[PDB]
């Protein structure tokens, strides 16, 4: 399905007329009608619940919709425009030629936030199909260019093939410190373990009292291991007997409830400890939601993993 320039030009004329129609339908100014408004209006007028968004109704600009097509690479006389046409990879080899030429001129003269573009992004800048070894050879040639004393002209070029990657900080978020009617500072957080959901209120000052659904923690958790879980966050930061806690937990069993409270208390306790202590709690596994939940049973087998006995042959 090749698409000519005349075909795309007609598709853009339709999109601009339809863009004004869509704005007229919704009673909005056609001049200030953006692509975000188009998507909102199309989702209302043509509601689709299909799980894959690519299968849903779309009214995008032709440039966004249609794929990139290389233009004709020769004229009426049949002479190709580019001197590397007969390689079949004129854009790739023209780039290798340009990078190789810069490496030569340097000799005559003489990380965290960025990555190399992937093969599928190079294959779009060039508008050609590339092998994996072609991609490697090009990257090996760019790396060889950074190690050299590349100037400003040789730095704008390398940055074209570098894509900024947004590292996400692992630093734990801190809850706001609130104040009650009596003026006592406290923090509040939540935790989930299996099907248990907990919400804990940790007071800045206290004597070590913990109330779980209004009950003393040792009466609510008669099993000693459930109480060790409540001790774990405070003990790890040397704050046993320094805070009062009132928490509520629902769902799950006794152990899942102790785990949900442990996570809720640890997150809320992060408001009253130093930043270095919060990173130690994170590295100790006290601030991570356990993703381990029951696996579904599959049909045709006894359990989530166990298979029916392989019958004796």
């Amino acid at each position: 399905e090749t698409y000519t320039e005349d075909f795309i030009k007609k598709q853009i004329e339709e999109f601009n007329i339809g863009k004004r129609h869509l704005a007229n339908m919704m009673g909005e100014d056609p001049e200030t009608f953006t692509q975000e408004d188009i998507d909102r209006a199309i989702a209302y007028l043509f509601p689709s619940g299909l799980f894959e968004k690519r299968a849903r109704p779309v009214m995008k600009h032709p440039e966004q919709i249609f794929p990139r097509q290389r233009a004709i690479q020769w004229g009426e006389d049949g002479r190709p425009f580019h001197y590397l046409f007969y390689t079949g990879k004129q854009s790739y080899y023209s780039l290798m030629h340009d990078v190789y030429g810069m490496l030569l001129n340097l000799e005559k003269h003489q990380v965290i936030g960025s990555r190399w573009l992937i093969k599928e992004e190079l294959e779009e800048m060039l508008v050609e199909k590339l092998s994996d070894l072609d991609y490697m050879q090009f990257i090996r040639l760019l790396e060889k260019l950074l190690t050299s004393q590349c100037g400003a002209a040789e730095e704008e070029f390398v940055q074209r093939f570098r894509r900024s990657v947004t590292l996400e900080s692992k630093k734990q978020l801190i809850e706001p410190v609130q104040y009650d009617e009596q003026g006592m500072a406290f923090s509040k957080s939540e935790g989930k373990r299996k099907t248990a959901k907990a919400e804990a209120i940790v007071y800045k000052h206290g004597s070590g009292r913990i109330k779980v659904n209004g009950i003393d923690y040792q009466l609510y958790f008669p099993i000693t291991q459930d109480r060790e879980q409540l001790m774990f966050p405070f003990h790890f930061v040397d704050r046993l007997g320094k805070h009062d806690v009132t928490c509520t937990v629902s769902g799950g069993g006794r152990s899942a409830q102790a785990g949900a409270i442990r996570l809720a208390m640890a997150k809320a306790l992060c408001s009253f400890v130093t930043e270095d202590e919060v990173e130690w709690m994170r590295q100790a596994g006290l601030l991570t939601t356990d993703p381990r939940v029951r696996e579904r049973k599959k049909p045709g087998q006894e359990g989530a993993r166990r298979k029916f006995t392989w019958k004796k042959r």
């Binding site: 509601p47 049909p299 045709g300 087998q301 029916f308």
Partner: protein, 88 residues
Amino acid sequence: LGISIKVHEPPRKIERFTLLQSVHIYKKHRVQYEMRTLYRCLELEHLTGSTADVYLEYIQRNLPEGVAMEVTKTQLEQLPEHIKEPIW
């Protein structure tokens, strides 16, 4: 129409069931199906019967295909005259 309306989304219901995959034997091979029922609850308050008739007729006629509606109406009534005082 000047009606006070609040909206919330009750939790969805997914009914799953299993069927044999083959026409004959091969019990351990099944095909599983589900029906997803999603909910939206519009809560209107302090409206007269005449206003409720127009609004419900307007939105019931425009109920999309595949969408069912359960409208629960809470009517305000005064005490029956017999109950106002004990006969005894």
